[PDB]
């Protein structure tokens, strides 16, 4: 099953507008292999990632994850971003973190301009338990059992400068790939769309 | 304790005149703040000895023109010449070629160790002045960003304190 997992498949979508403030949170991401939100109206279908279907048939999972944030700007856009890794669980008040407090956590800077789009950001296993359970089979929250080993925040590290004859937004795609992945104790569970 | 820390975010505009100082800050004092991981090592240890790594990234649109200056100044800009700043280890900016420079300077200070609670004078003072005016026509955007990524190099720690 390695053939479907490490191939980068689209999981989310967020643009980079120019009408935002310096350090404003754009999108928060629960980092897990269970992540998908896109769909389609015609035909009636909800788009799935190739990583999530492999991992939705297990009780536990363990392994690293690689996000691929591909931008499609013009050659004249600029500004930067900050890809901070905030660990823990899926349920804190994560949207109160100051931008300089995110500098203590591990991160990666990136320039928007240039001739290389995809930055292959890899997720380490920051965890308290060695085996991380599929909690989405249950319907009641419980401390001790988690599904996300961290949360990704794409900050507005700088604003968007642009010419007049283009638009005021740069779309960033979210692929999903994984490495050193391990799963056991099979089940069956049809996952639900995470609307964050 | 050695990782790039954004310390200031300003925006270089078109309405600035020639030789206008865009940024005026202390590199050492802005790294002394609660929102960084270098607070965790410097809070128990009073004395400090460090080199200064500087990387500054700007983002102009290619339908503008102009240039900047980024010099590293020990102490203050008391009576130094604006036109003779290239004797300092500097890095220039251009709307034609590049947008990333780096400057590595050593610890220039009257003493050897540093006291955080009562400094005599600031050790380094990063200066950014308008080297050429930013001109636009009609439709070209009238703003371009500016960011300063700074970090320590070769840190020593001596003489632990009980107070914060």
């Amino acid at each position, epitope marked *: 099953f390695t053939t479907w997992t490490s191939i980068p498949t689209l999981a989310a979508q967020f643009p980079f507008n120019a009408s935002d403030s310096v*350090g*404003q949170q754009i999108k928060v991401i629960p980092v897990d292999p269970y992540f998908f939100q896109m769909t389609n109206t015609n035909p009636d279908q909800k788009c799935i990632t190739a990583l999530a279907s492999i991992c939705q048939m297990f009780c536990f999972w363990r392994g690293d994850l690689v996000f691929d944030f591909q931008v499609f700007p013009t050659k004249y856009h600029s500004g930067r971003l900050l890809f901070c890794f905030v660990p823990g669980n899926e349920l804190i008040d994560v*949207t109160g973190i100051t931008l300089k407090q995110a500098t203590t956590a591990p991160c990666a800077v990136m320039d928007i301009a240039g001739v290389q789009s995809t930055l292959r950001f890899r997720v380490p296993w920051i965890s308290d338990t060695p085996y991380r359970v599929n909690r989405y089979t249950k319907e009641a929250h419980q401390k001790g059992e988690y599904t996300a080993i961290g949360k990704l925040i794409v900050y507005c590290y700088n604003r968007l400068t642009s010419p007049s004859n283009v638009a005021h937004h740069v779309r960033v795609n979210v692929y999903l790939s994984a490495i050193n992945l391990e799963c056991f104790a099979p089940l069956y569970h049809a996952m639900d769309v995470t609307t*964050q | 304790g050695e990782k790039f820390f954004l310390i200031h975010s300003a925006r270089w505009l078109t309405t600035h005149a020639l030789f206008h100082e865009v940024a005026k800050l202390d590199v050492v004092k802005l790294l002394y703040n609660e929102q960084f991981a270098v607070q965790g090592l410097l809070r128990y240890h009073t004395y400090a000895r460090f080199g200064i790594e500087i990387q500054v990234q700007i983002n102009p649109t290619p339908f503008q023109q102009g240039g900047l200056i980024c010099a590293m100044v020990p102490g203050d800009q008391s009576y130094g010449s604006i036109a003779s700043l290239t004797v300092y280890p500097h890095g220039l900016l251009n709307c034609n070629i590049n947008n990333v420079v780096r400057i590595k300077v050593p610890f220039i200070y009257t003493r050897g160790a540093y006291h955080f609670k009562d400094p005599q004078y600031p050790v380094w003072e990063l200066t950014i002045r308008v080297w050429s005016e930013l001109n636009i026509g009609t439709g070209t955007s*009238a703003y371009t960003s500016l960011n300063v990524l700074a970090r320590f190099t070769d840190l020593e720690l001596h003489g632990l304190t009980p107070l914060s």
Partner: antibody
Amino acid sequence: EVKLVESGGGLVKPGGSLKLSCAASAFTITTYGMSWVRQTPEKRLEWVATITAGGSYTYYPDSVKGRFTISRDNAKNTLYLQMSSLRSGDTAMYYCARKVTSVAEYYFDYWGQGTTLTVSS
Amino acid sequence: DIVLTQSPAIMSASPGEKVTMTCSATSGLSYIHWYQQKSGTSPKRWIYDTSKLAFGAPARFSGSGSGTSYSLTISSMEAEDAATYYCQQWDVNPYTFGGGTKLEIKR
């Protein structure tokens, strides 16, 4: 376009109660923490309530501490301000407010139209 | 808990001249925001920390200052600036705003 449209307000006798609300559109409010900003008719605004993305961290000032109660629902994408023990000092205009995050402090981006609560009988 | 006042209360200024108000803190403040209450509507994205305008705000304005006293210096007076501003700190528990400067048009 963002429309943080309030709803509620009216005429409550002093000693009564009221539950405010603010509808939301063009974005998910599940990230940004929201706020109620009260406009006195003497042009003196006051920051009285703010709860974060989850329903855990509440930041109450000295004045409304023990009087009012803020609540949210991330699925319905609306707001709630359960008020009680009303008096003439809170006879003022209300505004739902979105709080966003800057580099060292926080900041308000988008505000609403406003609901009138006159606490007098 | 500390009080933010504003030294201009009611100001009337001619089109095309220099206008400057002041939000004078009674303490050392880092970054003092500003707002714009237009007559009939609510304040919006107007000014953040000290010199960072919004995206829809006109680029003819200026803001500066260090330490206590900050100034929002207007370089070009126009007709759409007949509104009331505020000023805010973000460092205590009880966030109190400014007094309000009603800047109108001197005809």
